[PDB]
Amino acid sequence: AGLRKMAQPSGVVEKCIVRVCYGNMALNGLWLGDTVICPRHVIASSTTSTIDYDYALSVLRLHNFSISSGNVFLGVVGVTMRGALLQIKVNQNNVHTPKYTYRTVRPGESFNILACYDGSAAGVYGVNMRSNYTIRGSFINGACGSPGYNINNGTVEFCYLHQLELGSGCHVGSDLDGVMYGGYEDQPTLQVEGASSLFTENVLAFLYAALINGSTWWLSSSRIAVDRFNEWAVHNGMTTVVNTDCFSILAAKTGVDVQRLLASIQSLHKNFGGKQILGYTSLTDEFTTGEVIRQMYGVNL
Amino acid sequence: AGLRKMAQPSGVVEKCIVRVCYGNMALNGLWLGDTVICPRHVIASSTTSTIDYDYALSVLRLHNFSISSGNVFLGVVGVTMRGALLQIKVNQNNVHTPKYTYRTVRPGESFNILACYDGSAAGVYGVNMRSNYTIRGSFINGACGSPGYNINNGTVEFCYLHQLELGSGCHVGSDLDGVMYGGYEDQPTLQVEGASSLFTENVLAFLYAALINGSTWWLSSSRIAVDRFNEWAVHNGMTTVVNTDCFSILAAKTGVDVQRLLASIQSLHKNFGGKQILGYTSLTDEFTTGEVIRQMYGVNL
DSSP: OOOOOOOOOHHHTTTTTTEEEEEEEEEEEEEEEEEEEEEEGGOOOOSSSSOHHHHHHHHHGGGGEEEETTEEEOOOOEEEETTTEEEEEEEEETOOOOOOOEOOOTOOOOOEEEEETEEEEEEEEEOOTTTTBBBBOOOTOOTTEEEEEETTTTTTEEEEEEEETTTTEEEEEEOOOOGGGGOOSSSSSSOOOOOOBBOHHHEEEHHHHTTTOOOOOOSSSSOOOOHHHHHHHHHBBOOOOTTTTTTHHHHHHTTTOOOHHHHHHHHTOOOOOOOOOSSSSSSSSOOOHHHHHHHHHHHOO | OOOOOOOOOHHHEHHHHEEEEEEEEEEEEETTEEEEEEEEEEEESSSSSOHHHHHHHTTTTTTEEEETTEEEOEEEEEEEETTEEEEEEEEEEEETTOEEEEEETTTTOOEEEEEEETTEEEEEEEEOOOOTSBBBBOOOTTOTTTTEEETTTTTTEEEEEEEEEEETOOOOEEOOTTOOOGGGSSSOOOOOOOOOOOOOOHHHHHHHHHHHHOOOOTTOOOOOOOOHHHHHHTTTTTTTOOOGGGGHHHHHHOOOOOHHHHHHHHHHEEEEEEEETBBBBBBOOOOOOOHHHHHHHHHHO
């Protein structure tokens, strides 16, 4: 029973976390093999309304870098830059490097955040990439470099390195190829979050978990076809539906089709009335179909 | 910015999880030093029905215990029962045993759950102890023995060992001294759940966090005396507030007093009804004042 936004265990990722310092900057890096990865703004000036990374790199001294894993200092061999990241060759292999890949997360997808400060993990929590390519994180100053990832068995799948905070307080990172998510800039300017929509396919996922837990009071007696819901969605701040059938298992075990849930969704936005749905905004899109199926039955999506 | 129900990093605890098998039956155990601690229904009848634990115990053989830390089977030298736990002595001292301690949590306090299956960590998430000594967790079959803990500056503070799920989906565990939270029984017996009530203290903490984060639609134009609130609260499944102190810093920074928040809580109770507070269900009481101060300012108590 139960449904929790959870993280997967952080042990394997905690071992790769390092403290990178340069000039007036300190943040967190990822140490994999003999390369250390961190946000390039570690080499910026903290006082300019603007960062000239080209300048900053041109005039860089390797002996101004302070990088550590625990109390052990790693020696800087040299630096390369890619997108919003530095890739720092160091003189030591991290023996604790797990098997890993890189992936860029798509909107509506979940992953873990390991929130780091001074090169060590402080908290771990699950998030979901929003349609405006931000996440609703929890971060205070010094968090830059905090990694996001999923663990697929197996392999650590890195998807996020924490870069900045928008004016609304939601946050943005880059993938590990250095591409900023949503096209934002790694500049100290206060940038702005664009319009987002509840990710409908995840709302559906959430409803099924709720039925399965005996949350029923919201359940509509009526039903509504998929595209006719879609035309309502695009002008009601909710995303359209494409994955027809990742709900087959759920629909079958509840005997509640998708159209019925779509009807319930439409009813639920116009608000109430009653209260709880396990919790949970009543209408959250933080849970993917994969997640829900897993906490319901413990199975590879 | 941001507020997230998170977990502390689980690395130090993951290396203490083991598979505990008597026969026959299977669950998770905690391997500290040369002791394995696990729930005692591991020896109990494979589910039909009630457990005469003295009978089960008198008849027990140590070699009917297979205990695997991942790959290695541990060898059982002896066993002692404490409340609803078994403490099993083994051949070897868990090399990675952290500095630890036991503590029993009070209703309305938060801690971490490390959800284990087959003797190893699969998920981690933060919870808060409800006033009827249960927690709203996320477990499915195989989860018994999953530890709950707080990490206080290096020291792992063990406060919870998962024992059972009630008819409601509530979860019940014992402290690491074998004491069943809330007086429940580690029995396959039909069992009832006490009446709970939201911790107003925690709700306040949350609402103050919302303000600090510039979520301010929900905020009342009105005040209500603390006394008057307390009268209403006991008819509406909310705890009374009797100490104002722990909100001074927050009232300071926002300029907004608790009596104004109290009026807001009443108003939100008769629902709201359009959309989120920091991502949640208008209200939640899963956050303490300490939790909130911590994620806002990175500072304790």
